Design a binder for this molecule. Structure first.
Ligand SMILES: CC[C@H](CO)Nc1nc(NCc2ccccc2)c2ncn(C(C)C)c2n1
Lengths: 267, 269
């Protein structure tokens, strides 16, 4: 079933499976292949794959990574994705000394909010927004990736899995173990990412849950950011999930009135 | 607050209304199944209710499993001896999708009483995913009901439980309920529950949200009323047994209304 694909290099390992760069020998298309092993004598198809495939088949948006194909073998599942050249974590590290131009930061944040607004409008929580899961191309696009930890939610929400969002990007309502959490958790994460794009350092790099909470308590009670930027950031990082800005409302913020689509900035 | 998603609830409702049409099983499908019938499907669904109770699963999981079964049987001919295998794999898939802690495969094998093997369950899981093309995020009666419940002033727990009870009863009977969309069954269930408990009617705020009036809901409402009335004599009794419990405020013990007192202009009606 995979005869037409030539593997180029291993990209990495996300929530589940293994990702390879590959080329389609017939069309020339460069793709990312996510290989998923089953599990055919014990637990079958992992829930992570079931959720990601089902939701990504539904979610078609410029700022959500495109799932192109599902190749359904007896012992393995191959997901064919569009290939993106770089992830935001590697891009920020590469920009540690140079910094990232504000117009590109603004463009990336605007696009991430567009993608996230799309998710929430289609009853999907991402729940794993970290820089490693945000993918960029040469043309100025950024996209949400790795929906392995995603969840289709109901209105109103009920109690979902607690072990969600990597520590550094985890909203206080999760840290304190509230019985409910909602779309606000994803906004918190993007707020952390916004700050991290400006500084190229994680905003709350906690060593533990207590350290994480203390770091948050310190800051709320980013130098080079303007009044509009700090306004938006403070609303994205509101303690109260009810008061925290939505992705929709964020797109209308004064900060974005002059948004463009610059090309990175490094290769 | 944000748990009720104020900025997205209308977008979500509109999307779910789009998706329920796309996720709708074939209305006539059992007529094209040479070896199985609506009666056998009723046995299967009733069994899934029991399984859901035994393993303390979400009602949403039960609704999802039924959707998967109906969509699968819309496409694939299944012999009688394999019907429960389809059901078991569906419930496993629904559990993986919806549950924080789904039961392990071994528990799904155990509930089928060793008629099937673990390999069979796992291979069927894969077949169901193929047939459904991994499209598992289906709108359910339950998903519309929880949205409808928000229009209560204030919330009534007996109304909520009874609406859920009635929605659940509809899963058992392919004739008539296959011809109605989840949003419509939820609407009829909510009205019928509201009226039975409080005497209130389908709210105007829900008329504006859904575009459904008691006039458009009448056919489904009349079916659901008859189902409610005939419930204690149905061959399948697991939903009634379930809804006797304090968890669901013992709503299955309530007496159904004799008449709905719907509008009838003619003197002789
Ligand atoms: C999101 C995490 C994933 C695995 O580490 N990384 C990754 N990284 C991608 N690109 C960045 C990259 C390219 C080359 C080497 C390393 C990273 C990428 N492109 C498509 N896909 C997916 C959605 C299967 C990609 N996935």
């Amino acid at each position: 079933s995979m005869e037409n694909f030539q593997k180029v290099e291993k990209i990495g390992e996300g929530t589940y499976g293994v990702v390879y760069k590959a080329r389609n020998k017939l069309t020339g298309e460069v793709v990312a292949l996510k290989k998923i092993r089953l599990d055919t004598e014990t637990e079958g198809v992992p829930s992570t794959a079931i959720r990601e495939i089902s939701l990504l088949k539904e979610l078609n948006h410029p700022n959500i990574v495109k799932l192109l194909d599902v190749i359904h073998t007896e012992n393995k599942l191959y997901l064919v994705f569009e290939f993106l050249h770089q992830d935001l974590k590697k891009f920020m590290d590469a920009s540690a000394l140079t910094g990232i131009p504000l117009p590109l930061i603004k463009s990336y944040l605007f696009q991430l909010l567009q993608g996230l607004a799309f998710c929430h409008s289609h009853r999907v929580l991402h729940r794993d927004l970290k820089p490693q899961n945000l993918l960029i191309n040469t043309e100025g696009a950024i996209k949400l990736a790795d929906f392995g930890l995603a969840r289709a939610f109901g209105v109103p929400v009920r109690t979902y899995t607690h072990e969600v969002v990597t520590l550094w990007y985890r909203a206080p309502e999760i840290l304190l173990g509230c019985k409910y959490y909602s779309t606000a958790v994803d906004i918190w994460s993007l707020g952390c990412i916004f700050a991290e794009m400006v500084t190229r350092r994680a905003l709350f790099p906690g060593d533990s849950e207590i350290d994480q909470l203390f770091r948050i308590f310190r800051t709320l009670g980013v130098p080079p950011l303007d009044e509009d930027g700090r306004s938006l950031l403070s609303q994205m990082l509101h303690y109260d999930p009810n008061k925290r800005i939505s992705a929709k409302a964020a797109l209308a913020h004064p900060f974005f009135q002059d948004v463009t689509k610059p090309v990175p900035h490094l290769r | 607050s944000v748990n009720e998603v104020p900025d997205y609830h209308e977008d979500i409702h509109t999307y779910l209304r789009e998706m329920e049409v796309k996720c709708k099983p074939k209305v006539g499908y059992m007529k094209k199944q040479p070896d199985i019938t609506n009666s056998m499907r009723a046995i299967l669904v009733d069994w899934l209710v029991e399984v859901g109770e035994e393993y303390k699963l979400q009602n949403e999981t039960l609704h999802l499993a039924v959707n998967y079964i109906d969509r699968f049987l819309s496409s694939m001919s299944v012999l009688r001896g394999k019907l429960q295998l389809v059901g078991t794999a569906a419930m496993l898939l629904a559990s993986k999708f919806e549950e924080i802690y789904p039961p392990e495969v071994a528990e799904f094998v155990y509930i089928t009483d060793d008629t099937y093997t673990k390999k069979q369950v796992l291979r069927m899981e894969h077949l169901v995913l193929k047939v459904l093309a991994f499209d598992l995020a289906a709108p359910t009666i339950n998903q519309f009901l929880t949205q409808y419940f928000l229009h209560q002033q204030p919330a009534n727990c007996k109304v909520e439980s009874l609406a859920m009870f009635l929605g659940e009863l509809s899963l058992i009977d392919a004739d008539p309920y296959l011809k109605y969309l989840p949003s419509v069954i939820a609407a009829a269930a909510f009205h019928l529950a509201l009226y039975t408990v409080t005497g209130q009617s389908w709210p105007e705020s829900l008329v504006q949200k859904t575009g459904y009036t008691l006039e458009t809901l009448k056919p489904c409402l009349l079916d659901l009323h008859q189902t409610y009335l005939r419930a204690p004599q149905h061959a399948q009794q697991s939903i009634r047994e379930k809804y006797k419990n304090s968890k669901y405020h013992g709503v299955s013990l309530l007496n159904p209304p004799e008449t709905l007192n719907v509008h009838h202009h003619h003197h002789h009606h």
